[PDB]
Ligand binder design. Structure first.
Ligand SMILES: Cc1cc2nc3c(=O)[nH]c(=O)nc-3n(C[C@H](O)[C@H](O)[C@H](O)COP(=O)(O)O)c2cc1C
Ligand code: SF4
Lengths: 56, 429
């Protein structure tokens, strides 16, 4: 977070924990909204043989 | 007898098979045909059927069903409908070119067979459905029939025996499906050549809705010789349940492609080498052989090395005698392409009536073309096997089964070639 070192120290002391380590606000660890095109897999019955529905 | 295939010229039913003599009545009678036919007819229908059973004659059209029993099916008291007999002369099975030889070179033998069979089954008349392409053979057959009519061999008081029998010839119009017995019946009746669904069996309801029996040209033509020479004579040749002499239309990659009458249960390699001069390039150059026309599955060279050309032995070899049209394929043959061509033949000769045949055969043809190009995946081979199994046994006629069998044989014996071709195609792209 964009806070002065003094403010950070006061905040951590008042909380009693190092808040800068785990800040609730999300900055850059977020995943990119634009992602590579996925290729989802097929199921166990996506076969051209021994796939008779009577057996499943 | 343990070693078969030593048939002598004194034991060959078709003596003018090569057309080197007079096909007309004079030559036929000089060769022993049309001999004491009156006594044969007066002997009794039961006697004739018993002689056929003693000979152990089985269906020479490909089914292999015992001919004596099949003909005995129609030896019943008349139901009021005029009984008829049909002689299957379509010969549409690829590789099968025997019936043509019989009709064109010994037509009077076939006519005498028709008379004897009709007497044995109490048939009013016989309709020989010949293939339309066999126009000259049909002309020869008609000339023979005219000669028989004028000589009194057939017609009213046939051979002076009192039996009133007629022989009709109906030309086809280019349909392999017409080879099927019920499809043949429908074609004669004037409808599209689409096979019926048994029951009713043809013996009960057949041509013109009358008791009818369909028999192969060879099957009918051997009946008078079987009667005259005795059933024991016919039985002596061939193993038990595989007795007689079968015409072998050796064709393909052989040095001397020809049709030869040889004893049943003859070793395949012997038959190929004895008459056709062996496989082109030698025995080792052979790839595979289709023993019976095209419907029967192929047998690889390993099995071809030691196998008897009879019904039972070939059944053990995952194939059948069928029409005994040996199609020899050398190792310069793309087996995939050949089987695909056969599948295409079936596709272009399917009636289209039954859904499995109509759609599955075309689907298999597409997949086979893709296999020939290698444009596929290895699992598609198992998929094709499943498709063939689905078609087989689920169709009105046996055309679907006889089209599934080649694919099954190709997979079962040369799957490595298919997989390797697919690999090669993948590497190219
Ligand atoms: C697709 C198909 C084609 C056939 N083609 C012929 C043929 O060309 N000639 C023939 O004699 N039988 C052929 N048959 C067999 C006939 O249906 C019938 O069983 C046979 O003509 C009777 O022979 P058989 O009485 O000597 O046993 C064919 C069968 C099928 C299913
Ligand atoms: S397996 Fe067929 S669609 Fe057929 S009665 Fe047929 S030529 Fe057929």
């Amino acid at each position: 977070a964009s806070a002065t070192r003094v403010i950070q120290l006061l905040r951590n002391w008042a909380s009693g924990r190092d808040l800068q380590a785990k800040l609730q606000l999300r900055y850059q660890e977020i995943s990119k909204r634009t992602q590579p095109p996925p290729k989802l897999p097929v199921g166990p019955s996506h076969k051209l043989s021994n796939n008779y529905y009577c057996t499943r | 007898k343990t070693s078969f295939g030593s048939l002598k010229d004194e034991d060959r039913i078709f003596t003018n098979l090569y057309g080197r003599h007079d096909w007309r009545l004079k030559g036929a009678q000089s060769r022993g045909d049309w001999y004491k036919t009156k006594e044969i007819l007066l002997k009794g229908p039961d006697w004739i059927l018993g002689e056929v059973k003693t000979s152990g004659l089985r269906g020479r059209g490909g089914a292999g069903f015992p001919t004596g029993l099949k003909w005995s099916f129609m030896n019943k008291p008349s139901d009021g409908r005029p009984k008829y007999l049909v002689v299957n002369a379509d010969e549409g099975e690829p590789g099968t070119c025997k019936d043509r030889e019989i009709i064109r070179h010994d037509p009077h033998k076939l006519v005498e067979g028709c008379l004897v069979g009709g007497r044995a089954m109490g048939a009013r008349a016989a309709y020989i459905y010949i293939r339309g392409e066999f126009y000259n053979e049909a002309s020869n057959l008609q000339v023979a029939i005219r000669e028989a009519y004028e000589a009194g061999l057939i017609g009213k008081n046939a051979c002076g025996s009192g039996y009133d029998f007629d022989v009709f010839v109906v030309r086809g119009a280019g349909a392999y499906i017409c080879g099927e017995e019920t499809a043949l019946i429908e074609s004669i009746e004037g409808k599209q050549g689409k096979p019926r669904l048994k029951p009713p069996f043809p013996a009960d309801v057949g041509v013109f809705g009358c008791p009818t029996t369909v028999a192969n040209v060879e099957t009918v033509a051997v009946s008078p010789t079987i009667c005259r020479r005795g059933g024991a004579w016919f039985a002596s040749f061939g193993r038990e349940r595989n007795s007689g002499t079968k015409l072998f239309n050796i064709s393909g990659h052989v040095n001397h492609p020809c049709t030869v009458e040889e004893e049943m249960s003859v070793p395949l390699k012997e038959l190929i080498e004895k008459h056709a001069g062996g496989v082109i390039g030698g025995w080792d150059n052979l790839l595979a052989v289709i023993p019976g026309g095209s419907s029967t599955p192929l047998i690889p060279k390993s099995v071809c090395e030691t196998v008897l050309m009879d019904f039972d032995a070939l059944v053990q070899a995952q194939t059948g005698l069928g029409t005994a049209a040996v199609i020899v394929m050398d190792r310069s043959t793309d087996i995939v392409k050949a089987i695909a061509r056969l599948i295409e033949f079936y596709k272009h000769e399917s009636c289209g009536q039954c859904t499995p045949c109509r759609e599955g055969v075309d689907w298999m043809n597409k997949v086979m073309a893709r296999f020939v190009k290698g444009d596929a995946r290895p699992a598609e081979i198992d998929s094709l096997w499943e498709i063939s199994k689905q078609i087989e046994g689920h169709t009105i006629c046996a055309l679907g089964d006889g089209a599934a069998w080649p694919v099954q044989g190709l997979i079962r014996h040369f799957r490595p070639e298919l997989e390797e071709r697919m690999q090669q195609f993948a590497l190219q792209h």
